């Protein structure tokens, strides 16, 4: 009935600020952690409990840790507006960064910080009674996010065992780039994400920039817009735990319906009524129209085209004014289309959810206010195409050992490059093989 | 037909305080000792638990014993504490230290003569004496050692009366003390020789009663002691009020014990239900009998379903037809026939009393002799064997003076008790 | 627009009073500014009990 969020490095903390801003404003907790309640025992709710616990003085505090190796971003959180919301132990900061080296984070520096993080997570897990997973936010392009995220997921996987770990990951975009060494860190990261995650959602900033230019009317977007979109997606997926509805969906139902084989756990995400205020005047927003919207590749938050692959499973979350009969009519119309294709071994391709709470509006936000929305997470073979562009960049750099001396000097064997590159080749072949129609006797 | 009660140690003194509250309520005795009741039926058997002092007042025939006075000051501070005779409180000056040997041999023998003097003074004052009733824990220090010492002396001095004990024994799951297995083993060794009939209670079973059946939000030891006080005051009800089919402690013993070592019994009391639920189901004899045999309502961790009933007894309080009692007890005997020992043709005694406990129109208390009690003793013996093989804490007991041979004798006697129960528990087709 | 509650089938019409009865609803806190669709679990989970 609760979930714990782990935020790592710069992207993960900045996305955390938008997430906790939204969850506070949606539940109604004030910035100092107070919330009035009812004075008579028995007339009270619980929806906050998924994300907040209350102190004996009536302050609310959230089930999150913020992990960074550089101080600046956590000190920014400490001096901002939400200073009193977080417990100070939860905001953990080291002395110096991992300098874009996965090896520095994993072997040298994250090894010092990891035990404090594990002690905080243990202290959180002891104050729970129905924990049903971990949410992790990180980028695989930078050094501390890759190295410490991998090390921490390995340790969590040993200590907690069967408990689920769901990752939201900012992967390196296919032509927008921020640092030279991104391919090495992303390749080395993906091996750990392969072994130690139950579902992984992939994001690219280039897609969210395209989405904010095309659908919203923003000439000069910045990271706060992208982070607000991510926060809305996470709020949509966790709303099924927190509010009344016709068809609830527990986090184990996602894994049961979405994952066909235990390695085939990388999923695409999209969100439907991303629309400006001017458009709201001229657009109807029926169930079938937003369902048709979620299938356009212009709606996706990862730069991949699903027409180059086959769908295995789709999970559609409706929140707001929807009637099950309209969902059924929409899904039957989608099923009729010939540009939408499912693997022939998956005839019953869809999972539905219906929740009564409509999406919340944030004071500075850019999305319009709408009475209904739908959010989809889906598993498709097209993702194999996403890995190939990173692997080509790895081969280009590695042919001349362009930067390897940093990694070897900071403690890593050269062999780890070849192992990881072979593992990504095998993952690509797995997604090719699972997606092949039918079979033959010879 | 007068009963003398003995309460020993903190647990015993607390249960006694709750018992004497319940008994004083049923007979309408004010905490000043003045009779304020509203029917003659109350007076005609008041002698059973109270002696009469001059000018109206009544005082309760009970001896209070403990090794440190903290509890006595607590009971004197309680709501009914004033009723007790000042001369009846006997206490020492230093604690038992949770040690059986300390409670039994060194500080025990110093006080025991003054306790025997008070008990004899109380016994010889009765015009006809019925059995003794003793409450104590077996896991403690002064409770176990002085309780079993006193039991042995009273059994020497009054061998023709009845000796009845209610005893609480440490959970394997919810213990307060590390050296519980030694004290428990030595006390069970003393009881199986000394006692005539012994009832055993697990605090874990009372917690499960409170949480599952009563749905109490914040239980306290007072609730646990009320459940115990309810069954203890229920067993004696036919002694002290009229009824269609009278019964007696000796009559219970004669019908329950087939052979003299098999005298350990399970207890239950049927009308238990939370204040929210009570509006949804009326009380009736089929309902009381069904709850009465439901293991959820039994006050030990061992379950009847792993053994077989040799004998059982049900005492009914209230205005009711005899036909329903007889036919219900027949139906329960017929429907669960595999759980009843086949070489006894009918295992259940019934009894009916007109006067129910206050605030219930009707109630039943259940006493059961079932072989599943062997599982409790086996568990205690297992924990003892783990501790004893390694000499884990023995120097305390040996420094007080105990021979290790005492420990081996007590282990052997409990093991033979377990074997005797085990042979009768399982079927033999041959 | 940041504070008004959207008009739904499950909230009913505010200016006529009509409200359809459907499954999946729970008792409602009467405090101001709280959503009526927040989960209620007092009947099945007595919080802070022991």
């Amino acid at each position: 009935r609760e979930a714990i969020c782990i935020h790592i490095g710069q992207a993960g903390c900045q996305v955390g600020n938008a997430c906790w801003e939204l969850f506070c404003l949606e539940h109604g907790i004030q910035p100092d952690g107070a919330m009035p309640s009812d004075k008579t025992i028995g007339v009270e709710d619980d929806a906050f409990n998924t994300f907040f616990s209350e102190t004996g003085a009536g302050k609310h505090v959230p089930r999150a840790v913020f992990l960074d190796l550089e101080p600046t971003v956590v000190d920014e959180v400490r001096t901002g507006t939400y200073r009193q919301l977080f417990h100070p132990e939860q905001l953990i900061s080291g002395k110096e960064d991992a300098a874009n080296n996965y090896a520095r984070g994993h072997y040298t520096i994250g090894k010092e910080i990891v035990d404090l993080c594990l002690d905080r997570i243990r202290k959180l897990a002891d104050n729970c009674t129905g924990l049903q997973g971990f949410l992790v936010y990180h980028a695989v392009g930078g050094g501390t996010g890759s190295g410490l995220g991998a090390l921490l997921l390995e340790r969590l996987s040993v200590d907690y065992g069967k408990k689920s770990k769901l990752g939201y990951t900012v992967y390196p975009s296919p032509q927008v780039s921020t640092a030279v060494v991104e391919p090495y860190n992303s390749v080395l990261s993906t091996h750990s994400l392969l072994e130690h995650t139950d579902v992984a959602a992939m994001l690219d900033n280039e897609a969210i920039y395209d989405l904010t230019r095309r659908n919203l009317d923003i000439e000069r977007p910045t990271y706060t817009n992208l982070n607000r979109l991510i926060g809305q997606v996470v709020s949509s997926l966790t709303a099924s735990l927190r509010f009344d509805g016709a068809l609830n969906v527990d986090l184990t139902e996602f894994q049961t319906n979405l994952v066909p084989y235990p390695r085939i756990h990388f999923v695409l995400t999209s969100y439907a009524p991303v629309i400006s205020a001017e458009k709201a005047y001229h657009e109807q927003l029926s169930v079938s129209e937003i369902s048709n919207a979620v299938f356009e590749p212009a709606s996706m938050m990862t730069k991949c085209d699903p027409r180059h692959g086959k769908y295995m499973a789709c999970c559609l979350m409706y929140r707001g004014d929807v009637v099950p009969k309209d969902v059924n009519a929409a899904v039957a119309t989608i099923k009729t289309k010939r540009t939408i294709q499912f693997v022939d071994w998956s005839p019953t391709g869809f999972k539905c959810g219906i929740n009564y709470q409509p999406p919340t509006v944030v004071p500075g936000g850019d999305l319009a206010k709408v009475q209904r929305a739908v959010c989809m997470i889906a598993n498709s073979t097209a993702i194999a195409e996403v890995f190939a562009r990173i692997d080509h960049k790895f081969d280009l750099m590695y042919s001349k050992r362009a930067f390897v001396h940093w990694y070897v000097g900071e403690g890593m064997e050269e062999g780890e490059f070849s192992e990881a590159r072979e593992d990504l080749a095998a993952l690509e072949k797995d997604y090719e093989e699972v997606g092949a129609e039918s079979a033959d006797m010879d | 037909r007068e009963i003398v009660c003995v309460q020993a140690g903190q647990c015993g003194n607390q249960i006694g305080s709750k018992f004497w509250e319940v008994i004083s309520d049923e007979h309408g005795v004010d905490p000043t000792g003045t009779y304020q009741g509203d029917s003659d039926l109350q007076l005609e058997r008041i002698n059973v638990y109270f002696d009469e002092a001059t000018g109206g007042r009544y005082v309760p025939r009970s001896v209070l014993i403990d090794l440190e006075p903290g509890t006595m000051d607590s009971v004197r501070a309680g709501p009914y504490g004033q009723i007790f005779r000042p001369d009846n409180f006997i206490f020492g000056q230093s604690g038992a230290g949770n040690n059986w040997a300390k409670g039994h041999y060194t500080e025990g023998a110093e006080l025991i003569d003054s306790v025997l003097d008070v008990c004899c003074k109380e016994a010889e004052s009765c015009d006809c004496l019925q059995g003794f009733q003793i409450c104590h824990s077996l896991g403690g220090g002064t409770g176990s050692g002085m309780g079993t010492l006193l039991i042995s002396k009273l059994r020497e001095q009054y061998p023709d009366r009845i000796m009845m004990t209610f005893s609480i024994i440490p959970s394997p799951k919810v213990s307060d003390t590390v050296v519980e297995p030694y004290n428990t083993t030595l006390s069970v060794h003393q009881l199986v020789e000394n006692s005539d009939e012994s009832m055993c209670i697990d605090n874990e079973a009372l917690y499960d009663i409170c949480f599952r059946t009563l749905k109490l939000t914040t239980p306290t030891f007072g609730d646990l002691n009320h459940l115990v006080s309810a069954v203890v005051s229920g067993v004696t009800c036919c002694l002290r009020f009229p009824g269609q089919l009278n019964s007696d402690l000796r009559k219970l013993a004669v019908n329950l014990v087939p052979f003299p070592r098999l005298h350990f019994f399970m207890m239950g009391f049927a009308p238990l239900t939370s204040r929210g639920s009570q509006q949804y189901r009326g009380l009736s004899v089929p309902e009381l009998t069904q709850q009465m045999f439901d293991a959820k309502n039994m006050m030990q961790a061992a379950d009847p379903r792993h053994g077989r009933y040799l004998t059982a007894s049900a005492l009914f309080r209230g205005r009711m037809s005899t036909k329903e009692v007889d036919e219900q007890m027949l139906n329960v005997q017929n429907k669960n026939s595999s759980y009843f020992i086949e070489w006894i043709p009918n295992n259940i005694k019934s009894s009916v009393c007109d006067i129910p406990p206050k605030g219930l129109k009707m109630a039943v208390t259940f006493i059961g002799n079932n072989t599943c009690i062997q599982e409790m003793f086996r568990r205690v013996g297992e924990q003892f064997t783990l501790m004893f093989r390694r000499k884990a804490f023995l120097h305390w007991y040996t420094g007080e003076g105990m021979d290790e041979m005492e420990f081996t004798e007590a282990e052997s006697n409990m093991n033979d008790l377990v074997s005797e129960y085990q042979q009768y528990q399982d079927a033999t087709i041959e | 627009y940041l504070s008004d509650e959207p008009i739904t089938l499950y909230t009913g019409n505010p200016e006529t009073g009509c409200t359809m009865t459907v499954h999946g609803k729970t008792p409602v806190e009467p405090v101001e500014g709280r959503s009526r669709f927040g989960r209620h679990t007092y009947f099945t989970e007595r919080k802070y009990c022991l």
């Binding site: 025992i41 102190t55 004996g56 | 607590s74 004197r76 501070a77 939000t217 914040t218 | 919080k47 802070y48 009990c49 022991l50």
Partner: peptide, 26 residues
């Protein structure tokens, strides 16, 4: 008197622990 003070302390404790939230984290 000692008895009056003991009774008063016990009564106030019972008044405090009646609320489960206060028993848990007051």
């Amino acid at each position: 008197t000692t008895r009056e003070k003991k009774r008063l302390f016990m009564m106030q404790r019972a008044e405090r622990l009646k609320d489960p939230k206060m028993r848990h984290m007051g």
